[PDB]
């Protein structure tokens, strides 16, 4: 759309919040990371939305970066869908966390939080595990909706890119 | 500054990030909440940045809402500073969580995670507690930097408001 100033600034903000949610989602939480973290999507996807904020500065070089940011939004929206399912239906992609993050949490996992000893179902230990799992499910679904936000705004730009050219 | 389109959109995005970080920070995590959550700052502060996005639509009624959003940014930046200190130097403001959130986490606290039984310092239970405390410290400091972002942009508007009028 014509609103290239407004839309470019929205993209920079979506990029910065992906970076923030990514670094937040990299806070040590155990043996396994989300795929989003392991692919580094919030870093490389994040800076791509900052870069397509290049349409704040008013060539098909912009079409290249818009298309890359559209691919980033699509893949981020798929990756965060996958991690929500990975947490809540089965741990089907066991993406081992980066070992400098595992150094702080080497003995915990959040992809299962049922205790093997049933007396511990009441325990505070179990309630802590479900708290982290719920926070990760929250951060991933916040990241999903802002990844979906990017997809809408970039598609509404690349649509005008090709119909202009 | 003149960039009222760009700056208003930035404020709406800051508002949506606060609402998202707020709801995320309200995910059940035990007996005590951050002051930010108890004051509901990310909700009422969040919508105030959406409302001062009224300068997207180009009267001193806007000066009223800008000034309220500036007060919201200042108080949010103070409140998130307080909660970081509340977590990491002493639990000096014991803001009891809303009881419908405590219903899911009635037996855990993240403002202390040293176990009373020293054998448990190695335990996974202890590592879960420090994980949640680190996530809260992360979410609060992400919320602080975006609250500080608002303060800069609103001050750079209210400055022009009074020097225009």
């Amino acid at each position, epitope marked *: 759309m014509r609103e290239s100033k407004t839309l470019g600034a929205v993209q920079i903000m979506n990029g910065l919040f992906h970076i923030a949610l990514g670094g937040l989602l990299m806070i040590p939480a155990g043996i396994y990371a989300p795929i989003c973290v392991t692919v580094w999507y919030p870093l490389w996807g994040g800076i791509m939305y900052i870069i397509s904020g290049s349409l704040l500065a008013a060539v098909k070089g912009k079409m290249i970066m818009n298309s890359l940011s559209l691919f980033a939004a699509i893949s981020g929206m798929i990756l965060s869908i996958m991690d929500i399912l990975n947490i809540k239906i089965s741990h089907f992609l066991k993406m081992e966390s980066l070992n400098f993050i595992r150094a702080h949490t080497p*003995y915990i996992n959040i992809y299962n939080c049922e205790p093997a000893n*049933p*007396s511990e179902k009441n325990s505070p230990s179990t309630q802590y595990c479900y708290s982290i799992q719920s926070l990760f499910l929250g951060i991933l679904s916040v990241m999903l909706i802002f990844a979906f936000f990017q997809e809408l705004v970039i598609a509404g730009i690349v649509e005008n890119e090709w119909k202009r050219t | 500054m003149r960039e009222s389109k760009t700056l208003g959109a930035v404020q709406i995005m800051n508002g949506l990030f606060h609402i998202a970080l707020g709801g995320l920070l309200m995910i059940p995590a035990g007996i005590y909440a951050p002051i930010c959550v108890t004051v509901w700052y990310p909700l009422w502060g969040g919508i105030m940045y959406i409302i001062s996005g009224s300068l997207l639509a180009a009267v001193k009624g806007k000066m009223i809402m800008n000034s309220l959003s500036l007060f919201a940014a200042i108080s949010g930046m103070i409140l998130s500073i307080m909660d970081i200190l509340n977590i990491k130097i002493s639990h000096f403001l014991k803001m009891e969580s809303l009881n419908f959130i405590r219903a899911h986490t009635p037996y855990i606290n993240i403002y202390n995670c040293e176990p009373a039984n020293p054998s448990e310092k190695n335990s996974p239970s202890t590592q879960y507690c420090y994980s949640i405390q680190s996530l809260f410290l992360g979410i609060l400091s992400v919320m602080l930097i975006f609250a500080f972002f608002q303060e800069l942009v609103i001050a750079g508007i209210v400055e022009n408001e009074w020097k225009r009028t």
Partner: antibody
Amino acid sequence: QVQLQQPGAELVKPGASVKMSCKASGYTFTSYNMHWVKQTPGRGLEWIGAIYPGNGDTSYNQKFKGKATLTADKSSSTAYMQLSSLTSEDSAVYYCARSTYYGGDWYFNVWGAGTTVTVSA
Amino acid sequence: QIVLSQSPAILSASPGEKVTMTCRASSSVSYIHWFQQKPGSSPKPWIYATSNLASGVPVRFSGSGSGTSYSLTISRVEAEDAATYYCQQWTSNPPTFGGGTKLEIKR
């Protein structure tokens, strides 16, 4: 003193079911988790699941969650495991074992003698 | 769900020989437990929480390790030490045993 007694052998038809038992003695039966462990020469020791006889909570190994069904009687102080739909691959020694928490971790500190189940026509 | 890998699968040790067997976890675990089984009997607890000998285990045995790498070592094997030794972990649900190491008397 502390002892878990099991029937030493069970012979059961394929497709049938068996309800082996584990008589606890010498300790407060309701104060400890009772665990069941399978052993087969081709797979080693597989943990099946546990019951807390105090309330009645169970947890199960996912690869057993419909094969076994744990139970406990507070009064006779006996744990039970029922295996459904028995096949050749259910022929094993089955141990009950009592887990304490001790030295800063869980610990299978006492074991039954084991029940040898043979599933045969 | 953590896989415990034991090496060697058979350890042949001459009486009085110092020997070591190792347990390697597919992920780091807070502690390893060791059980001794002789044929026709249930697994006796042998070492708990990495290094504590169970009641009546000869101080001839010791255990050590951390993270993903653990071991049990015998300062001198007796003829009575011939058995299969299983490592076990509690750090993840379900708890899992190793494949065992059969200790054999070398002659």
